Nucleic acid binder design. Structure first.
Lengths: 207, 261, 155
RNA sequence: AUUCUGGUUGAUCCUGCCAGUAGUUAUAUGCUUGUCUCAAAGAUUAAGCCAUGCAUGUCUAAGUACACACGAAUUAAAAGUGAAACCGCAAAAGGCUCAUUAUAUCAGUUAUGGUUCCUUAGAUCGUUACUUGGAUAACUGUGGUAAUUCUAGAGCUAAUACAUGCAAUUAAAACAUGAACCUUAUGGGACGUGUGCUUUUAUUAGGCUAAAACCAAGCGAUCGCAAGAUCGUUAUAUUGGUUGAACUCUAGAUAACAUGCAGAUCGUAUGGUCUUGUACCGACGACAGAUCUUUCAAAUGUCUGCCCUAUCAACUUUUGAUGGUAGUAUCUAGGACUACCAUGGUUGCAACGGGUAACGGGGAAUCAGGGUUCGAUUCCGGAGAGGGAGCCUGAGAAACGGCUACCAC
RNA sequence: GUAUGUAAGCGUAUUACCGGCCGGUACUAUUACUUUGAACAAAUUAGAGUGCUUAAAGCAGGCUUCAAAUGCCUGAAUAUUCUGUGCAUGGGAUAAUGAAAUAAGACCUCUGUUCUGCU
RNA sequence: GCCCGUCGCUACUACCGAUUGAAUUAUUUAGUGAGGUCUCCGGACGUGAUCACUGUGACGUGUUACGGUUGUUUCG
RNA sequence: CUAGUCGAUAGAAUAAUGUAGGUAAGGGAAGUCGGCAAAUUAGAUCCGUAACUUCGGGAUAAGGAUUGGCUCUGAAGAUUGAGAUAGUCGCGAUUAUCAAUUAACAAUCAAUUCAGAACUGGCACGGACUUGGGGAAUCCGACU
């Protein structure tokens, strides 16, 4: 019954407002979600008229946006690394909106080698010399239009070095963008341009 | 929606445009939430009982519409307190009556008879030319008709002629300063033609300067003005004498020169 | 004043460094979308070629200017990106047939296009959504911006 | 109907009151009464306590009948009656009261591009059992109990209840991706698929003066044998609103994400079709469901208006005061709440505290004006159902002729 | 004869344009006050209409119909307490504010001797 | 003539006053905490399949068609 | 710990009364000349504080809350600045201006205090020690 009415709150001059209409249904504030990092548990609730809301708690995985080309891949959220609001939202591994998350860098690698025939990041040679089966799916040249179009493509393989390191280490920093307590998903965007320059102050330089 | 939704209507809360008795009964019809507004709608219970006088009480009327005798715009409308708003064509086919809701000279409702071919169509203002409903373009009229696929030239605040046997539009008129009009709901409600000017106040309520047939002028807002044709050229047969808004002396001579005397 | 200084990163909702694949290269000279509040007020230059974020600006934030447009002398400008204006009016009584000087002080948000507002500029405002507990308004034009006698002739 | 008379004095003229006078849907009470027409009527004191009685239920041709109660029985029609009992809906409106409550409620004015909403309305479904699953109440039967308040065990039986899903549920087509192709270019793919709805995130154009010089394709075409460089017009640098603008609407595209939805319903009245194949088909629904719109609303918000009081002048951050960023929660804005950060806000133009025999308004009383006084009370808005608190069902209730505690009785 | 209360010409932004003196446009120091409007429930009140037998009320009701009624309508106005704020518009008396003095007197401008560009 | 206090008696109304007096009403710091909402776990009985129980229908007896005061490992 | 001692007449046994120290159901001053004696409280952080007053105090008035362990987070500083940019010699070696930077700028180093937060156990946490009971009065002396 956690009411969100302003019939508390001593008014803007400081004086108290007195009684006001014992409580009302339309002001209920249901408790929090605190979506931790587990096995996809979702409880659904019933709201103002009719409609339902799917609360995440112990959420597993999300489909993130590669920002600069708009590609969405369902991927494994590893863990959280930052939160602007509260540091117990880091340590207790609560996913909320825009809290910075390490995820995978693998399902963006495999789903780009069509467009990104030079594959990112550079996978290691001393133990992965076997081929299951990349060069056949890099180009194969087809004697036909689309692998010829991959030379009309691959003029966009100019991705930043900062993502080139994380794509080699296979742990890409992505920032969540949905409200997981209110939609039951965590579908973030990969921070690339303006924030990957930023937020590594807020992780690396604060050691 | 709390403590709602207020399903009664006393007397002295209903609009006085219904010209209701004040005593006799202590409630009003409560027009049941149809395609027109609450105060903008003369409910079928008032039209039959009070000013057609065909059914004398609230029980004799529900034996009529449930006999499926009256119908508005081809739909049977057997809700006994259906809203049945303005410019509608109340077609009582037995015994061949063809009624319409048109406001008075004095702005209240009247009784109006028309022809059968006049019962084929009606005029409706448009409010919103939204885009996205069926299929891409879209148009919602004043009375709650969603005429899909209109003409593209028809922007907002025009009126179209919808032949109500179909849902097609066939005669649209542009809101411009050479046009007959009619006012629905102010001080000047029930005054006809022939607008000269809209004073475009950005944000909002650009009030519209109108000049009547007899040369007098008035003014209302844009939501009140309902265009009904070009200069001195309607598309509907106007009521008793034509919304000219007589003086307060002109009641007196007419009450004696046009009386049994 | 601020080169994007908060532990939360500041950015405008809706725009991105989108570099490679795009219909043409619509750089807009910078990736920053500004509105125009369009009630007649000239959209300020610093809202189009400026670098402030201000999610509560009407020109470049999640707001629209609706409702009533009012004015009044600015009174203090201390709290962060909001100011205190002071209306003045004249209430009138029937019994004495004489007016009376009154005043209501309405707090109003002030986006950082108006750096160096100082008491008492004449400003012009307009209602928007409730912004935080007092502020139901947003600045629109520091119109006169001129202390009449005692304020603006420098020294 | 803009009015005054007695009263201080031996006498006078004054200031001054006290008394007279008068109205009061304004309250009691005294005496009084033949008709009659309308008629306020446990508000004040005690929002104190209450016996009984009642005040909320409900069916059409049309969601379900196996009632001997039977209409009926060679119409085993069963449509009558259907009592029941599911289901469906309403019970959140009425009706009362005036305890709270002082910018609160309320009034007028404006917003919601900061929001949800049942129903009535208008668009509103070519995306492998097919017309399936069991199980249930009424009904039989057996019981418990000081308790008519309740209810267990058992035997059955239906659906527009529950649960699953196909015979067109059907793809063609549209159309991309890879792909029969092959080719230099506002050129060409046979086909696999994918194609819905709603959800969520991201990217994209998002409401638009005119000429060339010049150049990459070298397009019609030009120079030319051509390649390929020159230039050059039409269709083509073609998405809406208010048209007061990023309204993020459903629209439009792209990459994708999780969960369901996608008529197994119903009868009046039956037919065209007889090939009688029960193949091919009528109006329909009080029916059902998804989306946009409409309506009845609602909750917030805006500017202005609110009594007495200074023997109340300073207040506001215990543990939000005012603002910032981010968040969480909500239907939604928001210090509504958390986190960090800023030191702000308010007032002699009366803040803050106190008082109220304070519900606010429409309005009522009373004079010539100016006014004082009143408004518990039929209409509107608000609150409350002995007290405070809590919460289920729902579209809607912090409900009380719903439940859950505790206190009092 | 005069009168004067009349509109225009004329000590001129009696205002850039196209229309037949005339429409439509291009085009505008505020505020207070004031004029006219819009906007907003009735009931009440002010009140015109109406022989409820009169009246308080009410919102009905009239009518060669005299021997057939078909017998159309009056209606259910109108302004004030819905004061006040707020919103339009006419006016410029009164009343405050406002300019050009450590710098703006301008140029209708071919205009840039800035360059921001923009389709 | 008028007129003034003290004192005296009678009656009445307010006052200060040890008692750190009593009665009450409204807020509230701190403590204990009913009942609920949420939620980590719990998982009774009853379930679809299944190792499997075996009859007949079947198959080469077993298992299933079909049933079980079937039990069990299986697994939801 | 370093240095220094076990020297106080020793053994057996543990009666009564004692001198010294503990605990005690229920009640809590009834005991008594009189709460003598004992008991309670006590460190620290935060809240909070009355009569009266010489305005300085009263006051630690009163009355409350907190505290262990473990794993974390935040705040408080110091020396170096970092040093773009052009080329030489042969990456080595070699040669310098400043807009800004810039808060634990980037290094390096040091301090121990203060604020939080999870987890945790007769929920015993100032766990020994150290260590005010408090309040309303009267009488006397002002006070040290």
């Amino acid at each position: 019954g956690i009411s969100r009415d302003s019939a508390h709150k001593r008014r803007a001059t400081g004086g108290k407002r007195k009684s006001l209409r014992k409580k009302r249904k339309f002001e209920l504030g249901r408790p929090a979600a605190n979506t931790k990092l587990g096995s996809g548990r979702v409880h659904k609730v019933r709201t103002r008229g009719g409609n339902t809301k799917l609360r995440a708690l112990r959420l597993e995985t999300g489909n993130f946006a590669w920002a600069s080309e708009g590609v969405a891949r369902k991927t494994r959220i590893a863990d959280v690394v930052y939160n602007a609001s509260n540091n117990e939202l880091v340590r207790t591994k609560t996913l909320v909106k825009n809290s910075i998350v390490v995820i995978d860098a693998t399902p963006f690698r495999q789903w780009y080698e069509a467009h990104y025939v030079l594959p990112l990041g550079r996978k290691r040679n001393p133990k992965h010399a076997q081929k299951e089966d990349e060069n056949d799916v890099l180009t194969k040249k087809r004697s036909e239009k689309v692998m010829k179009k991959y030379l009309e493509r691959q003029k966009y393989g100019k991705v930043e070095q900062a993502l080139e390191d994380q794509f080699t280490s296979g742990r890409i920093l992505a920032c969540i963008s949905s409200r997981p307590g209110q939609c039951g998903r965590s579908d973030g965007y990969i921070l690339e341009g303006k924030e990957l320059e930023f937020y590594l102050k807020k992780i690396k330089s604060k050691k | 929606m709390a403590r709602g939704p207020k399903k009664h209507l006393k007397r002295l809360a209903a609009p006085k445009a219904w010209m209701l008795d004040k005593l006799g009964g202590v409630f009003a019809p409560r027009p049941s939430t149809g395609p027109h507004k609450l105060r903008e709608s003369l409910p079928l219970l008032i039209f039959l009982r009070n000013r057609l006088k065909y059914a004398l009480n609230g029980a004799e009327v529900t034996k009529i519409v449930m006999q499926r005798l009256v119908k508005v715009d081809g739909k049977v409308r057997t809700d006994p307190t259906y809203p049945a708003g303005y410019m509608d064509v109340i077609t009582l086919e037995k015994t061949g009556e063809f009624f319409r809701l048109v406001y008075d000279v004095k702005g209240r409702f009247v009784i109006h008879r028309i022809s059968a071919e006049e019962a084929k169509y009606k005029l409706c203002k448009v409010k919103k030319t939204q885009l996205g409903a069926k299929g891409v373009p879209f148009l919602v009229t004043h009375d709650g008709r969603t005429i899909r696929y209109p003409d593209p030239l028809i922007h907002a605040n025009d009126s179209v002629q919808v032949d109500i046997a179909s849902g097609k539009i066939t005669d649209y008129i542009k809101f411009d300063s050479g046009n007959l009009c009619m006012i629905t709901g102010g001080r000047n409600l029930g005054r006809v033609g022939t607008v000269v000017n809209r004073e475009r106040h950005p944000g909002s309520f650009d009030i519209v300067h109108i000049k009547d047939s007899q040369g007098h002028v008035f003014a209302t807002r844009l939501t009140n003005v309902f265009i009904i044709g070009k200069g001195n050229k309607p598309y509907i047969s106007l009521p008793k004498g034509k919304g000219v808004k007589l003086s307060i002396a002109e009641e007196r001579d007419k009450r004696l020169a046009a009386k049994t005397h | 004043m601020a080169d994007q200084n908060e532990r939360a990163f500041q950015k405008q909702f809706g725009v991105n460094l989108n570099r490679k694949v795009k219909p043409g290269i619509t750089k807009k000279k910078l990736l920053r979308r500004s509105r125009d509040v369009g009630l007649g007020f000239k959209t300020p230059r610093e809202a189009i070629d400026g670098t402030y974020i201000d999610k509560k600006c009407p020109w470049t934030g999640d707001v629209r200017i609706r409702g009533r447009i009012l004015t009044g002398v600015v009174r203090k400008a201390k709290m962060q990106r909001t100011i205190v204006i002071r209306r003045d009016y004249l209430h009138f009584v029937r019994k004495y047939s004489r007016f009376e000087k009154r005043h209501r002080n309405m707090s109003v948000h002030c986006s950082p296009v108006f750096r160096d507002v100082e008491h008492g500029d004449i400003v012009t405002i307009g209602e928007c959504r409730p912004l935080s507990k007092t502020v139901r308004f947003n600045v629109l034009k520091v119109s006169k911006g001129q202390g009449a006698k005692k304020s603006f002739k420098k020294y």
